[PDB]
Design a protein around this ligand. Structure first.
Ligand SMILES: *[C@@H]1O[C@H](CO)[C@@H](O[C@@H]2O[C@H](CO)[C@@H](O)[C@H](O)[C@H]2NC(C)=O)[C@H](O)[C@H]1NC(C)=O
Ligand SMILES: [O-][O-]
Ligand SMILES: [Cu+2]
Length: 225
């Protein structure tokens, strides 16, 4: 249980959508990140909720950043039972902006930019550092990306209850970037849709985290420039 609380993008601080603050205001604040219900998991890989969380909507703002630059995401406190991989994807929005665009359930627009899984057969996972404050994560915007508006999808997949399916707990959330710079590339391989990328039967989705086994991270190969 948790969500990305804020980030540092293009050197600037952004408070993400706040599910326990924003809905109660007379006028919810403009955000660079998309609405989420709260800190609970999505458990249905066939649902659009797996994309940007349940009952989401486009965000009003974008955060400017240079291709090749580093982004920091800061999670709320991550429970130590919630071992699992941490994965980040991007998708290019229309040049008219992400603010009124949501990929459809069959839009193969998402490319994986970073992933981490289980360290060998140990109990150390990519989620582990987030279990000790400050709960911080970094990713690099690929340096070759053509300037434009992009959605970023970030998730932890907690596997403490994933022996069968449904069981795996997905904690996805999306934020919006204006990528700038000298890049010329638009990813056109390793593209997937959400839903679609993950199947209930994937070895990393139905998974026994309490046996001494290695872990196959779900989804496509990582994009490389
Ligand atoms: C950024 O979001 C993070 C994560 O929720 C906040 O980090 C708590 O911040 C306090 C005060 O700085 C620390 O003592 C805790 O250790 C932090 N918790 C975690 C889970 O890291 C942080 O305060 C937010 N930043 C801003 C500027 O509001
Ligand atoms: O509820 O964790
Ligand atoms: Cu939880």
């Amino acid at each position: 249980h948790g969500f990305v609380d804020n980030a540092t993008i293009g050197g600037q601080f952004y408070q993400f959508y706040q599910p326990y603050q924003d809905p109660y205001m007379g006028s919810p604040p403009d955000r660079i990140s998309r609405k989420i219900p709260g800190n609970g998991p999505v458990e249905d890989v066939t649902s659009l909720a797996i994309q940007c969380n349940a009952d989401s909507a486009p965000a009003k703002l974008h955060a400017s950043a240079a291709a090749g630059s580093t982004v920091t995401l800061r999670w709320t406190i991550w429970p130590d039972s919630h071992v699992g991989p941490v994965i980040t994807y991007m998708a290019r929005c229309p040049d008219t902006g992400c603010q009124d665009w949501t990929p459809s359930a069959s839009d193969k627009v998402w490319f994986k930019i970073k992933e981490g899984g289980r360290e060998g057969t140990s109990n150390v996972w990519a989620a582990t550092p987030l279990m000790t404050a400050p709960a911080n994560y970094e990713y690099a915007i690929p340096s070759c990306l053509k300037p434009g508006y992009y959605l970023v999808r970030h998730e932890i997949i907690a596997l403490h209850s994933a022996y069968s399916y449904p069981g795996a707990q997905f904690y996805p959330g999306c934020h919006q970037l204006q990528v700038t710079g000298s890049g010329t590339k638009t990813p056109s391989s390793g593209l997937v849709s959400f839903p679609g990328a993950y199947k209930s039967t994937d070895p990393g989705v139905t998974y026994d985290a309490y046996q001494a086994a290695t872990y196959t991270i779900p989804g496509p190969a990582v994009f490389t420039c």
